[PDB]
């Protein structure tokens, strides 16, 4: 019932997540300082990824007036005709520039249709817009991310009715934590007192390009809530799942999009089909300390393998004994951890893994369904 995904990745300091002061995000896990990528950063980078461009239904826009302006094409695209949302009920002054709406992008034609007719005026138009706003949830990333848009506290009483605008999320993303302690950056105040040498250590080491950082990522898609969010259309939900998996495999959270480097591919995927969500984040409570960064990923997979074996044969029940898949570049000992009890199908190809996941879910294949 779940399409639980556990990933182990690398990310250069060029591609990270920052805060209001520009510092990279951090967290404490197991009492030690770590590196963190927020869930909203990973959630949005899937939407803006090139793999999710096919579906990409929905805009979270503060300025609905400017979005509807080029769809309306008339003088009636502003004034109180587009301040109609205040009579519909918005927190205009208690929130900075109104409130955000998670509106589907292929529904602005209806908003243009209502605003382009002023025969009924603001009366009965400030409230019939509410039904279109509430019904604008048929969208892939609206189904995954889920919206909560609520009416205001003072302007929702002018003969205003509202239905359940909130749609339940069908995807849970954890804050991606590293598997080791946070490496400090290079000091630059020491340049006035001493020198590292003539292309020597603490300096011109090269180290390929930079100092990467291993990251453990966690996703939990629920198939039933995803299907009920889209009101049927089971093949479209399957396409959404496959596109999301392909996007999450090869997308950097920040800019500098990869064209074809093959280092953006994750070193380990663990697609599992439980009915109760289990996180293996407790594999790295003990920090993964090492001097060599070549085998850091390898021993991280080793620790994850030990913990997943422990959990899967310790919390095991006979009613639903389920197995999963696994991907690696046939490099970091994929045959030889936990004696392939959970591994079953060992896959070295992204598209073949997506095909296997789609086969296990409903029996489809990735290359077949790409449309509505």
């Amino acid at each position: 019932m779940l399409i639980e995904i556990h990933m182990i990745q690398n990310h250069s300091p060029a591609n990270l997540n920052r805060d209001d002061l520009g510092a990279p995000k951090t967290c404490y896990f197991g009492g030690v300082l770590r590196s963190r990528i927020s869930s909203q950063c990973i959630k949005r980078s899937i939407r803006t990824s090139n793999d999710f461009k096919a579906l990409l239904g929905g805009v979270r826009t503060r300025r609905l007036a400017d979005l509807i302006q080029q769809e309306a094409g008339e003088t009636e695209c502003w004034k109180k005709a587009q301040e109609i949302l205040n009579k519909c009920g918005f927190k205009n002054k208690d929130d900075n520039t109104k409130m955000l709406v998670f509106m589907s992008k292929d529904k602005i034609k209806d908003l243009a249709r209502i605003v382009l007719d002023n025969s009924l005026g603001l009366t009965e138009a400030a409230q019939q817009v509410a039904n279109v706003i509430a019904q604008a949830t048929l969208a892939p990333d609206i189904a995954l991310c889920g919206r909560m848009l609520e009416p205001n506290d003072k302007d929702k009483d002018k003969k205003v009715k509202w239905s359940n605008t909130t749609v339940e999320a069908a995807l849970q993303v954890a804050h991606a934590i590293s598997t080791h302690i946070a490496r400090p950056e290079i000091d630059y105040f020491v340049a006035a007192d001493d020198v590292p040498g003539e292309d020597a250590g603490a300096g011109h080491i090269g180290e390929s390009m930079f100092a990467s950082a291993c990251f453990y990522k966690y996703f939990s898609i629920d198939w039933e809530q995803l299907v009920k969010n889209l009101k049927g259309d089971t093949n479209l939900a399957a396409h959404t799942v496959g596109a999301f998996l392909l996007a999450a495999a090869k997308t950097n959270p920040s800019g500098k999009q990869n064209s074809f480097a093959a280092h953006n591919y994750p070193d380990g995927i663990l697609v599992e089909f439980k009915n109760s969500p289990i996180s293996y984040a407790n594999a790295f409570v003990r920090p993964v300390s090492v001097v060599k960064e070549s085998d850091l990923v390898e021993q991280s997979i080793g620790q994850l393998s030990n913990y997943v074996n422990d959990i899967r044969l310790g919390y095991y029940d006979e009613q639903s004994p389920v197995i999963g898949f696994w991907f690696s570049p046939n490099n970091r000992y994929p045959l030889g951890y936990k004696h392939s009890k959970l591994a079953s199908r060992n896959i070295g190809n992204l598209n073949e893994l997506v095909g296997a996941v789609l086969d296990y879910i409903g029996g489809f294949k990735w290359e077949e369904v790409q449309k509505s």
Binding site: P24, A182, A191
Partner: protein
């Protein structure tokens, strides 16, 4: 010249007042405080404890360069401010009523940089990606109005082609002006691309009272927005008489608000 180091606590208990962390919200406040760190002689003798009203004309207006970055010290998050100037700063006089601003006491080291031809320095630099466009005034009006006509020349943020990358675009933007300041870049890696915000008061003359003697002055706050790009890399040198002047001054505009500081480590 001298390099100064200030350490500010970024973490700590988030339910307590943290005036050191709140100070980094406005970059004009940072610039003003660093300017107050430059007493002008008789100000120290008249006010040793810094309690008389603050006056910009009572302090020296010598330029300085600073950079605010972030780091981790063992198990704690810290914000580091590196101040590069030409006169000896006095951090004792500046924070003597604000010892709680800094988690650690300030440091200062004398800098004597000179590099002959043949040095492959490792550099870090935060520039202001600014450019003056020939046609930056389309007057994109809002609301019902969408297009009215006026023209002016203004400074705006750097833009890149939709078929190109920001990394390569900023690399060629830096390399295009590079031989004027006297270095050759081997690698240019983009690490950050964002904005820097601030606010500034300005006096305004509202109407004269009964013998107001030069109108009634009221503060009005105007915003400050900059586009910042931080990048590291490796660069060689040529014409060290030009590179020393490059190190003494800054690179790019808005030098007084944290930009233009070039940090170089010899290799």
């Amino acid at each position: 010249i001298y390099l100064s180091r200030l350490l500010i606590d970024t973490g700590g208990n988030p339910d307590r007042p943290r005036p050191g962390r709140k100070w980094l919200d406005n970059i004009y406040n940072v610039h003003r405080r660093l300017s107050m760190a430059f007493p002008s002689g008789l100000r120290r003798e008249q006010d040793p404890h810094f309690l008389k009203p603050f006056s910009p004309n009572d302090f020296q207006k010598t330029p300085f360069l600073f950079r605010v970055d972030n780091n981790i010290d063992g198990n704690d998050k810290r914000a580091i401010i590196i101040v590069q100037s030409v006169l000896e700063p006095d951090w004792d006089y500046c924070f003597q009523n604000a010892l709680d601003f800094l988690a650690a006491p300030p440091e200062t080291k004398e800098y004597n940089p000179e590099f002959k031809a043949g040095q492959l320095l490792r550099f870090r630099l935060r520039v202001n990606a600014s450019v003056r466009r020939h046609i930056p005034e389309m007057v994109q009006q809002d609301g019902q109005t969408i297009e009215t006509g006026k023209i002016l020349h203004k400074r705006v943020s750097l833009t890149w082609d939709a078929s190109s990358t920001p990394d390569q675009a900023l690399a060629d933007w830096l390399a295009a002006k590079s031989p004027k300041l006297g270095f050759t870049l081997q690698r240019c890696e983009l690490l950050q691309l964002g904005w820097v915000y601030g606010s500034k008061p300005e006096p305004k003359n509202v109407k004269v009272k009964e013998q107001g003697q030069g109108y009634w002055r009221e503060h009005k706050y105007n915003p400050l927005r900059f586009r910042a790009a931080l990048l590291e890399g490796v660069l060689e040198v040529d014409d060290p008489k030009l590179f020393l002047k490059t190190l003494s001054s800054g690179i790019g505009k808005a030098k007084s608000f944290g930009f233009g500081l070039l940090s170089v480590l010899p290799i």
